[PDB]
Design a protein around this ligand. Sequence first.
Ligand SMILES: *[C@@H]1O[C@H](CO)[C@@H](O[C@@H]2O[C@H](CO)[C@@H](O)[C@H](O)[C@H]2NC(C)=O)[C@H](O)[C@H]1NC(C)=O
Ligand SMILES: OC[C@H]1O[C@](O)(CO)[C@@H](O)[C@@H]1O
Length: 246
Amino acid sequence: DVSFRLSGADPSSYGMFIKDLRNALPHTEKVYNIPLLLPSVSGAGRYLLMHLFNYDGNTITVAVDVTNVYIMGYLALTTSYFFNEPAADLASQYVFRSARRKITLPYSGNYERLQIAAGKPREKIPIGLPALDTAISTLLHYDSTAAAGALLVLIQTTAEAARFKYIEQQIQERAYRDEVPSSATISLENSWSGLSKQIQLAQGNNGVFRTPTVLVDSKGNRVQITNVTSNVVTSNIQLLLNTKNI
Ligand SMILES: *[C@@H]1O[C@H](CO)[C@@H](O[C@@H]2O[C@H](CO)[C@@H](O)[C@H](O)[C@H]2NC(C)=O)[C@H](O)[C@H]1NC(C)=O
Ligand SMILES: OC[C@H]1O[C@](O)(CO)[C@@H](O)[C@@H]1O
């Protein structure tokens, strides 16, 4: 399991938690020197338990599918919550089994369904460690609408940041002050599946993408990524979704 405590949190420890998070996802091959997540993992080995603690010491344990880094649900005190999606329901059969009760959330884990439940897109949701501390708290006490929001904060704080070095940086900049994600942050999140597929097709295409990826950069300008030499691939992305799952 991996852990992060906000009490005393700073860019340094958040860095370590996100480093641990990356270290817990299994791979057996690297593509252009970037861990390639497994196609599948059978059983309970498929789920990683993150222990998160809000500033007052309360905790939630989040379950993550180690082959894609999708959050499946979480345990808050003695209740468990899982998205309304097949993978989550399957996941429910291996984790938080001893929860006194299980709540299926009213919506699957997609950013689209989550934003509708929350009443706003992510573009308007402040993130940062403080925001992550509100999220831990919100989820300790079931509220479907507030959870939609807390969950968009949680996924980004933890999954996207593990997947992208740039996102981890955005959060470290937001250690004591939340702020809506830069649009390049939203682009990366949206292009992960695609970059992952393209980093892999390039393997036998001399490092060239079969299809380019359109991104938004630091300045807010639209750039096209067409080969492995880009900074997105050399520095930025830290994990790849196996094409067997794309
Ligand atoms: C691979 O992408 C690189 C950019 O990352 C391309 O090289 C650059 O492309 C033009 C010059 O032709 C400029 O806009 C960049 O500043 C160049 N960068 C560098 C460092 O040289 C390259 O052409 C792409 N290759 C393919 C096959 O698409
Ligand atoms: O936008 C939908 C996507 O949002 C995520 O929660 C985070 O990347 C994924 O589980 C899903 O594919």
